[PDB]
Amino acid sequence: PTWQELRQFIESFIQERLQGKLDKLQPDEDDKRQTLLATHRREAWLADAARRVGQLQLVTHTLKPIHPDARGSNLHSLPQAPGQPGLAGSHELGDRLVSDVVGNAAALDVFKFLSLQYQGKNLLNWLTEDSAEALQALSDNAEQAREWRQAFIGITTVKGAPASHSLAKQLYFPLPGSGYHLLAPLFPTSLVHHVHALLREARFGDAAKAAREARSRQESWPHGFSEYPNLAIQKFGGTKPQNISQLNNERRGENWLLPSLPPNWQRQNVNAPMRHSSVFAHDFGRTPEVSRLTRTLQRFLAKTVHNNLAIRQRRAQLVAQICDEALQYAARLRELEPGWSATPGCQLHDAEQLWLDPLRAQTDETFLQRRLRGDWPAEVGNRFANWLNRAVSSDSQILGSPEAAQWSQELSKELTMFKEILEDERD
Amino acid sequence: ILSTASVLAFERKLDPSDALMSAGAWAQRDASQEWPAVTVREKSVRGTISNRLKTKDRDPAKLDASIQSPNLQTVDVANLPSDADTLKVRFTLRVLGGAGTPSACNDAAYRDKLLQTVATYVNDQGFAELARRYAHNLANARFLWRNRVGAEAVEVRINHIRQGEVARAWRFDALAIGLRDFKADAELDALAELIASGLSGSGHVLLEVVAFARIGDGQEVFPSQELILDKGDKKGQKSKTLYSVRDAAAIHSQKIGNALRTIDTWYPDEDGLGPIAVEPYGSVTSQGKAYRQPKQKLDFYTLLDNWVLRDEAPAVEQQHYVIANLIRGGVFGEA
Amino acid sequence: ILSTASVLAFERKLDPSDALMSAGAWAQRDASQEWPAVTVREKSVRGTISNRLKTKDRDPAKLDASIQSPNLQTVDVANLPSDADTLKVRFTLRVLGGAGTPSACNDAAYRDKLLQTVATYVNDQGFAELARRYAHNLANARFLWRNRVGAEAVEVRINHIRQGEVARAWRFDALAIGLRDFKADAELDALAELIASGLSGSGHVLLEVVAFARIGDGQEVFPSQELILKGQKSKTLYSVRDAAAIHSQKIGNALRTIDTWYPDEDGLGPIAVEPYGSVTSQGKAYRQPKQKLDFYTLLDNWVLRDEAPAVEQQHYVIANLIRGGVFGEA
Amino acid sequence: TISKTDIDCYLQTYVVIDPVSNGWQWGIDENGVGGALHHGRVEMVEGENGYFGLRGATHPTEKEAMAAALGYLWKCRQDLVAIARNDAIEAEKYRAKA
Amino acid sequence: VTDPEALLLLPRLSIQNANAISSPLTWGFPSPGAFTGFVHALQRRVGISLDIELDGVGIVCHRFEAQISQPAGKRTKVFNLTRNPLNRDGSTAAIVEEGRAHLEVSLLLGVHGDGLDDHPAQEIARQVQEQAGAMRLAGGSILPWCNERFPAPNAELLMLGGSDEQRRKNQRRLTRRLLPGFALVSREALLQQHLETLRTTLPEATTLDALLDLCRINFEPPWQVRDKPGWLVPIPAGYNALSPLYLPGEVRNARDRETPLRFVENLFGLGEWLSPHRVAALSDLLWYHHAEPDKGLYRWSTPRFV
Asked: CDD domains per the record (chain D) (predicted)?
């Protein structure tokens, strides 16, 4: 916090840039050393930095990821937190802001100069507050240091009138009474950089690679790890990502979008269950979802029931999910053809074919329509329960205890719901 | 002073869908509702090098050792079946209407002047030259892009779909209707008047365009190829991916729209190409050259500024091009 | 100056289909439309080590220990059935025309110069030498690649298909018509004038080429082969839908085997029309660019600086323009 | 210089070790999440006589079922191995960076 | 907000190039702001003439196909793009990656007003469907169903039931009609209580991290994966203010110069794809707007869910 050591640090940094240019210069003639030591070695480099602060800008929400021929206004704005619970984004960054920089890529020497952590903090925040060590180390004149401060503090101030381009997005939002607001959203590069760093740390970090070794060795570990499936890479600069922002050079494009996908985003096809007789075990149970569901029940049905509520709610919602995928299987099977049980056979599940093909009633007006409306074919739930009791293990310790009675109770409860849904199929 | 709007945005009128291609036999085109879909499958290719050497790698050792290490690609290929010689390409077209009304306009002065200018056009000469050419590019199957270049017979069927059914049906010989002459015809004039009444009215006109092309047994059909950057590592890389909606090959909707917009025979360069697509700074992606440059006063921005701002109305051809851009859509506007 | 264009994309003329292979008995080749297709199936193979040892594996304990545990595999094999001695390979071939026109070209003046060059070629000499050799490669069943080499009698039936029906039907003996001499026949010249009328744009030509090869009962046929992603699966064969097939680019490569004009010896016979005319089997590129006889130097002298090559070399150049390709620099 | 167990670090998410009463039967998760309940596209296979379960021998310990799973993935399915290879290379570059 | 008097059902609408990029952090199904803005545009275009107030939308998504591809040797996905026109000099334009997805959603619209009495139910259902056929739902065209087996019609279900059994009966009749999909709701109470649990685990936790924790599949040591209650997707649940509210003719290059502009920023909340018979009342699960514009915090959710 003495001005002499900060003077030593700034002259040391510009002398490091001097030896950097004289190392990556490869000059032997033309006398570039004179103009090189006249430009980047004296205190006129700070005058050129006070010129170059106007080209750069510390930004938190830039507009350049929206279509890059959009010359709008970028913001270093931190939003206030919602009082409403649940949702949040980009105001959660309290000390973990990365403070993106847009502008010229050859002008980033000013940002490398501002990113120094010389005493205990950045020189930026030292230039915000009034201090004696500030405004005196980098000068010998007072008013020149004042105008240098007013130049150097302007990297966090938005330049120009507020503007969002025609290529930028702006979207009407209806107020509760009769109004609209324009709502031009900006791209959060600091939030994307924080989520990108979190994802790279959870996937490639040392504490994650250690638990990844411990699962591949099948050993035990203190902590676990994470996967983040179904990510999508969205790149912003095509072949030149430097023109979008500074942080889009660290992540070369690579937005790393999270999957907000519906569960029927892998919808394979529907095949009419012709050559079988127990559709819950051949075409329904062969689906990739209910196999995982029944295996998770088989894991969850043979254990200690001391955690009665937590295991009981899990088994109830799992049986609800299995009867749910049964109802979705019967629902999506109605797009096949109106008649496929009319295709002749001998063993084709003639009690479940009253359920999975209701459009034979449109063809057989009195022959097959009146045989499912008076019977109301809903004994399918009992066969569904006989299929679902193959998920429980054949253990006498599971049979004698109250676990079998509680399992049968909530299983019959969800089967009452599923059968009551199948009861009123005719409205 | 009537400056230009800083935000201009016209929606896309003439909004097609993905052209589903299926397959069967000619002389049962009338029962082509259960024709099986052309599926996109993979095949393996192995090729030698054929691109130009860069005058430093022309020596025979490197060339002969480079034909011993060939590139091995898995490409997507869509073919007709070996018992089907006819390709049925089917899509739907919505002709929306409200063709001069912008979806976004800053200035109410510029908006009112542009609506006054568009209404002056429509009363002076309606959508009858534009929709005639749109009906041509429907009638000749220009949307069959490479699926047309060797066909024995192309036949386009267009059905005006009203509230539940076909209100009025057309049927064209798409090879008699050329890809370069926007002539006159009675049924083309009826279809043009329908596309005009769609582009004028407040509601959409829905058409069902089906084009059968008698290619040959087992021949290759050419659906749209997908713009996939980052194909990945070269081992399991699929070097060509063909577009297909649901296990059924297809042409992209913007490719069908690009074929429908090919009405522009008004650009100042000579018509060795004939019609090109209506674009601001009218630029053919296959030619790599932008006609209608701003160094001449014949692009869409200069003509729209002269027509709306200072009332220098162009000729009827260039104002056809301007209103065709307004039907085409686009995001215009300066900073 | 008239430099060459940076994009140049010629569409492929002479489009073949995937050559489906069926299987039946000879002397009922005429009723060969219900012939069951050759199915690609799996058999397990097991071979001892037979490649060259790299001077370190010639240790006898290492050699015997590698022989004691040989590699198991599971190849895809396609055979004729044991009661069927004939292979019917059936494709269609569509001859398009418009050969000198590119599908993509930056320069308009270069495209005009190239079109004038190809037009002067066609006006001086049509597609009459080219279509003769293409009709030969249809007539001698070169598209039967290894299905031809030990066949007793190969017979090709080429049908020109107008409207929906057979307009003019040829029937050749593919073993009397050799693989290396382009002689003259009446029916070969009729097929050549048809492929000429197709390649000039003066008609619509869709041929259907059926080739019967009398191999033997139960013998092995050779469809096209895919690249592969104990049971190592060392060979994967092509098939469209449970029916073995040859790739269409293999059929087209056999149809382009017309280039008898390369500067080396004529002992090999015709090779395929490729720029820097290369054979993958022999590992050698004839028409190297160091001699002035590859496609690019001949084209850039014929079109840019108006040095018209020899008549056979411009036959080769227009055969490349019929062939297709992505020409043009970066 | 990326070793085999660092590739196994990202290859182990493609396997699933289901518990049976005899032992531990490994399987293959095609979506790479260890057989998760919702995001997990597990690979089920058809065997000799009505076998619809995980491809994998019922091993006594999880240490050997996972090892047989990794050995199967290394022998046969080299696309998931290339996935795990590129994951391991990006992890090594990440520790070279951060 | 206010309860729907009736519940209109737009049937399975096919959208061909919807915005797969929901937000800067999420891809997949488009944002619920797209659907709420579509229903406000339906109100703005046909609802002010039928004297009804179309408010609240329930999103169902029978079929979803994203135009994505998985590159070779990569675990993640990239987007299949479109080839834009050239520049005026003939070069290829700079590629801006947009995600396109083919949807098949059916919308449940809350309808309340005095126009329910003045008009028949099928008339206003037909009018909002014939107006929706000329519209777009997330940037993608609504395919208008020509020449299939039969066109899917509407049903405006009056939520006022004469009895509770009849009300449960026609909720079942509507749920059976929109069954092969999965209704999208908002679970932000679950996000907050998961944040509270993660804060009792480790202090100084943000609910961005709790949202991520509900997104991942966590592997746990003894190995087992941590189970989840439902599908639990991340959705953009609105906007948060970055700038103060600017006057209409004050900001530069706005959409209109008669509406106050304010630079905003996404607010990622939690969603949950559940089947429509798990709600037991379809007059819930409808997405409304909540502005509170003096604070910022322009957001959508489905209140009255649980």
From this structure: AcrIF4 (cd22557)
What does DSSP say about strands E155-158 and E6-19: parallel, antiparallel, or unpaired? antiparallel
Say if residue E50 is in the same domain as residue E144: yes
Q: What is the 3-state secondary structure (H, E, C) of chain C?
A: CCCCCCCEEECCCCEECCEEEEEECCCCCCCCCCCCECCEEEECCEECCCCCCCCCCCCHHHHHHHHHCCEECCEEEEECCCCCCEEEEEEEEEECCCCCCCCEECCHHHHHHHHHHHHHHHHHCCCCHHHHHHHHHHHCCCCCCCCCCCCCCEEEEEEEEECCEEEEECCEECCCCCCCCCCCCHHHHHHHHHHHHHHCCCCCEEEEEEEEEECCCCCEECCCEECCCCCCCCCEECECCCCEEECHHHHHHHHCEEECCCCCCCCCCCEECCCCCEECCCCEECCCCCCCCCHHHHHHHHCCCCCCCCHHHHHHHHHHHHHCEEECCC
Q: E26-28 and A258-260: which strand pairing?
A: parallel
Q: Checking DSSP bridges between strand B8-10 and strand A173-174, what pairing results, if any?
A: unpaired
Query: What residues contact residue C326 under an 8 Å CB cut-off, 6+ apart?
Result: B50, B51, C8, C9
Q: Is E265 helix (H, G, I), strand (E, B) or coil?
A: strand
Q: d(Cα E22, Cα A260) in Å, to the nearest integer?
A: 8
Q: Do chains A and B touch (3 or more CB pairs under 8 A)?
A: yes
**Whether residue E194 sits in one domain with residue E175:** no
Spatial CA neighbour of E264 closest among A166, A55, A168, A84: A168
Residue B314's identity, in one-letter code, is P
Q: Are residues E164 and E203 in the same domain?
A: no
Burial status of residue E201 (CB atoms within 10 A of its CB: 0-12, 13-18, 19 or more)? exposed
Header resolution in angstroms: 3.2
Q: Measured between alpha carbons, how far is B329 from B116 in angstroms, rounded to an integer?
A: 18
| Cα gap E264→E261, rounded to integer Å | 9
Phi, psi of A167 (to 5 degrees): -80, -15
Write phi, then psi, for E252 (nearest 5 degrees): -100, 135
Structural domain spans, chain B: 1-11+99-126+263-335, 12-98+127-262
Tokens of A97: 């802001």
User: Looking at the structure, do residues E147 and E27 belong to the same domain, yes or no?
Assistant: yes
Give the CB-side neighbour count of residue E14, counting CA atoms within 13 A: 12
8 Å CB contact of D86 and B236: no
Using alpha carbons, list the distances in angstroms from residue B226 to A201, B147, B161, B241.
Answer: 33, 17, 30, 6
Q: Is E148 on the interface with D (CB under 8 A)?
A: no
Domain boundary among E181, E208, E225: E181
Q: Please report residues of B whose CB lies closer than 8 A to that of A163.
A: 335
Shortest CA distance to B326 belongs to which of B276, B256, B261?
A: B261
Domain housing E285: 182-302
**Are residues E222 and E243 both part of a single domain?**
yes
Of E123, E147, E181, which residue sits at a domain end? E181
Query: Using the beta-carbon criterion (under 8 Å), do D79 and B236 form an inter-chain contact?
Result: yes
Is residue E39 domain-shared with residue E170, that is, in the same domain? yes
Q: How many residues in chain B?
A: 335
Let me know: does C106 contact B286? Beta carbons within 8 Å. Answer: no
Number of domains in chain E: 2
Compute the nearest-CA separation of E213 from chain D (Å): 14
Tell me, yes or no, whether E10 and E96 share the same domain.
Answer: yes
CA distance A363 to chain D (A): 36
Residue of B67, B76, B83 to mutate, interface with C, max C Cβ within 10 Å? B67
Cα-trace Rg, chain B: 23
D82 shares contact with chain C (CB less than 8 Å): no
Residues E153 and E251 in one domain: no
Closest CA to B45 of B77, B4, B14: B77
Choose from E225, E232, E274, E275 for mutation: most chain D CBs within 10 A.
E225
